[PDB]
Amino acid sequence: QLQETGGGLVQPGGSMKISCVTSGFNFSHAWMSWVRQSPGKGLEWVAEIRNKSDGYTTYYAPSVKGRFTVSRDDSQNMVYLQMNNLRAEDTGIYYCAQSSPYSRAMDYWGQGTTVTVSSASTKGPSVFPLAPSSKSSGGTAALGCLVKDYFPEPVTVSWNSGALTSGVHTFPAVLQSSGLYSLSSVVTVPSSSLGTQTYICNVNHKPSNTKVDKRVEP
């Protein structure tokens, strides 16, 4: 019923235009909104465009007014968001939605398109071992891979090419003050396996088209 496009990477000061195609309801009558989600700022309403009968009246969140422009094309069932003078704070998943005239609820949201605003160049991760500790209590050892200094999100980590899944924990990335992301992936294994079994983390980073395999040993 709704589907967003156009998101990607851009530097602070830059511009980007995103779009949303719709179906399954009368578009020309509908009010349409944009809402964005930045991981750890929840949902934030961004803009609205109505018509139903008259005006193509537009409304904006204070912090994007002037910078952002919402438009529509009734003949193609398209809503647009033109974004200029972008800042790092604008980074997020942007969703288009149908705004109800009754409750001003947003009724039917698309899957979203992500806009990432940063000075960082795309870069694949450096992958370091988190080596099992020597000695020890119950015969379980934890080991892992530190996946450091990549941009943008995301990376995927597997273990022994997907053959090791039990007890794997891959943490969410944190954005470091450098503008690069970092995470770790860990797994717990039997202490008695450490001589006989090899353990390799496979780190895939689609935006750089890089794949890095790292063996982690004592």
Partner: protein, 216 residues
Amino acid sequence: DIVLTQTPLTLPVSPGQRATISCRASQSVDDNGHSFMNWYQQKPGQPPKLLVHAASYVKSGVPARFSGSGSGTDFTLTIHPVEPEDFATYYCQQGYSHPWTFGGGTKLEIKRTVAAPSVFIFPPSDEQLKSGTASVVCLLNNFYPREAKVQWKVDNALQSGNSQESVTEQDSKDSTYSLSSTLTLSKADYEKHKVYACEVTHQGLSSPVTKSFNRG
């Protein structure tokens, strides 16, 4: 702008029990007998979905164990009983006046018994040290509830502002969390000290647990 105070940020519920989610608006969102407060549900990697509009009107197809209530400035979403598919994040949103605003969210988490973390510490690799940075990682594995204090100490000096925590979602088998706390220092700073210690306080532990190593 109408600020919405949604409480709590994280709400444990046992399967079968009631979930009560509150949303206070900083002024009234009533007009002509309608209270303009809407509720949404979001699961990871998915858009939000409208559940309730005008405070209490459940959207068609939403199950009956969801109910919205309240008026003026105080509103409630109740889920009774909480079925396993209901564990998700919930948001309130006022449609009274522009800008439209959302509450900060409420994640329903599965209540289970207390489980103490297993704690592990990892020196930086010699490989990372070559590059000029040192990352020291403390792992707390498979614990519940989420709340845990992780202190770093470096030759007994308490560390401040050079560490970041990251926590997994509840495990799908056992409903526990795991957490990493990563201390980032320059190679220079790393080399000035000997003892690196991670102290973990969690209600599952009678006394705090320290894991440490000496650089070497």
